[PDB]
A paper describes a structure:
A putative open reading frame of 1458 bp (cmgh1), encoding a protein of 485 aa (CmGH1) with a theoretical molecular weight of 53.48 kDa and pI of 4.66, was identified from the whole-genome of strain C. marinus E4A9T. According to the phylogenetic tree, the protein CmGH1 belongs to the GH39 family. Therefore, CmGH1 was evaluated for saccharification potential with different substrates, which turned out that CmGH1 showed β-glucosidase activity when using p-nitrophenyl-β-D-glucopyranoside (p-NPG) and cellobiose as substrates.
Diffraction dataset was integrated into the monoclinic space group P21 with two molecules per asymmetric unit. The first four residues at the N-terminal region and the residues from Val396 to Thr403 were invisible in chain A but were refined unambiguously in the electron-density map of chain B. Therefore, we will discuss the Chain B structure only. Structural superimposition showed that CmGH1 shared a similar architecture with other GH39 family β-xylosidases, despite that PslG and GH39wh2 only shared 17% and 13% identities with CmGH1. For example, the β-hairpin motif of CmGH1 extended from the catalytically active pocket and held onto one end, which was not reported in GH39 family. However, the β-hairpin motif of CmGH1 was far away from the nearby small α-helix, indicating that there was no interaction between them and the β-hairpin motif adopted a closed conformation, which might be related to its substrate recognition.
Residue numbers in the entry: 4 to 396, 404 to 484
């Protein structure tokens, strides 16, 4: 029995906690998409802070399409009646009602249609009034509902998401950026959602070169990463460092890095245990808290019901019927930890999958200590002959060298000493929540005590996630 030894100083912040708990997916029914469960309250309890809109039925299709935001491209682009906002309005309102911001992805109806825009001038006008609808109340719209506007989704994923040329993609990006900034310079615009971020190409170097040479705004560079071929929660930090270096190389030192998709698996035939995945995503969140990632979108916090490809994506962490499990439990405990504002020092975790993170709320009355015990499986600790991952859709991408020395320490439990509780030595409450092979994030036990220090110990086998919550008792 190997027992990890953790210590937290609860009385002094080391710095600000960074709110990286973004996600994508459909949280509740909307007109025309009413078959999905209502899980919006779970997003609220998880303290989701950012929602990518791409998986909604909220596409700006480049041909005529009833479900598109502009369904008839012959219609008057100045008339609100020409726009189809109803379902998107519902999802925007749902997202704002839980206090989350929106990353609105401007994209065609992938995969049914990936053609570029036929009429760039009209495309630009239509993008601008979509923005005005969600930012300036245009056409019975919202005020300041969408802070981030993304153009693109995996243009380098073969021709499966974009069938135009790179030049056509770049001009479309510039039109969208012009329209967003014309509505409100304070809005953030970016792209292109690189699918293969360690691969040179027209949508990495060629995209950065274009926005530089043509002086196009780029508030964030967006990209994706999945753990399919590593199962290593460290990957997101590793990739972000490399992306940061390439973006800086083009002079874009103020541009943020936005992780538009991240998941243990992104291959639609991937197989995994619920509890392994839960521990992975908690460890990944902890590791990327110290990284070049500035904003992150977990893929995907719903049932995986995909109304574009018309299947159930296994990356959807909820059960088909909306019910909960270890993944949804870990998702909530992570978000609650990331919602603290003052990060606290925790010492004794490691970089081989026993990840720990501590923080306290702004009012000082709640300490949260998040612990994931995750083990990279043995078969993923073998170095590859060649650091390229090949998969069927036949495609290939560059992957980082595997961390062959990152085998789990194999802890079976932990003891945790929290000192200097900030409200003093009076009454406090200790509550523990667990997501593992037997639990879905619910509370396991609790007690009340006194003193400015508290010691907590538990068995916590690999593939388990635990949240320790310490509160002042009134």
């Amino acid at each position: 029995d190997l027992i990890a030894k953790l210590s937290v100083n609860a009385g002094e912040p080391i710095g600000n906690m960074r709110q990286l708990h973004g996600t994508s997916g459909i949280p509740a029914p909307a007109p025309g998409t009413d078959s999905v469960p209502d899980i919006l309250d779970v997003w609220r309890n998880a303290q989701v802070t950012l929602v990518r809109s791409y998986d909604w039925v909220s596409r700006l299709d480049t041909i005529d399409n009833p479900t598109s935001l502009f369904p008839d491209w012959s219609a008057d682009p100045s008339d609100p009646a020409s726009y189809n906002f109803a379902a998107t309005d519902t999802w925007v309102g749902q997202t704002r009602s839980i206090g989350a911001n929106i990353l609105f992805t401007i994209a065609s109806e992938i995969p049914a249609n990936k053609q570029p825009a036929r009429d760039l001038a009209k495309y630009e006008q239509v993008v601008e009034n979509i923005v005005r609808h969600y930012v300036c109340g245009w056409g019975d719209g919202f005020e300041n509902a969408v802070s981030h506007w993304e153009f693109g989704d995996q243009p380098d994923f073969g021709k499966l998401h974009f069938s135009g040329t790179p030049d056509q993609f770049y001009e479309m990006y510039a039109a969208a950026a012009r329209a967003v900034k014309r509505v409100d310079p304070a809005l953030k615009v970016g792209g292109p959602c690189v699918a293969f971020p360690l691969n040179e190409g027209p949508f990495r170097e060629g995209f950065l070169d274009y926005v530089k040479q043509q002086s196009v705004p780029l508030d964030f560079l967006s990209w994706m990463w999945y753990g399919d071929n590593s199962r290593d929660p460290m990957d997101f930090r590793t990739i972000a460092a490399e992306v940061r270096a390439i973006v800086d190389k083009y002079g874009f030192t103020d541009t943020e890095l936005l992780l538009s998709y991240w998941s243990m698996t992104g291959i639609p035939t991937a197989k995994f245990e619920d509890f392994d995945n839960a521990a992975f995503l908690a460890a990944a969140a902890i590791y990327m808290q110290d990284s070049e990632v500035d904003k992150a979108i977990f893929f995907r916090a719903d049932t995986g019901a995909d109304f574009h490809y018309n299947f159930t994506d296994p990356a959807g962490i909820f059960e088909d019927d909306g019910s909960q499990n270890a993944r949804t439990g870990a998702f909530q405990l992570v978000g609650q930890t990331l919602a603290t504002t003052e990060r606290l020092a925790i010492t004794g975790g490691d970089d081989n999958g026993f990840a720990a993170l501590a923080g306290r709320t702004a009012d000082g009355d709640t300490i949260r200590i998040l612990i994931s015990n995750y083990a990279i499986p043995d078969m993923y600790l073998t170095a590859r002959d060649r650091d390229v991952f090949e998969f069927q859709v036949d495609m290939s991408l560059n992957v980082p060298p595997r961390r062959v020395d990152a085998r789990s320490t194999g802890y079976s439990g932990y003891t945790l000493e929290i000192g200097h509780l900030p409200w003093g030595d009076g009454p406090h409450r200790v509550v523990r929540y667990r997501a593992d092979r037997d639990h879905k994030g619910e509370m396991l036990d609790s007690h009340e005590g006194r003193g400015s220090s508290v010691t907590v110990q538990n068995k916590l086998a690999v593939s388990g996630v635990e949240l320790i919550e310490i509160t002042r008792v009134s």
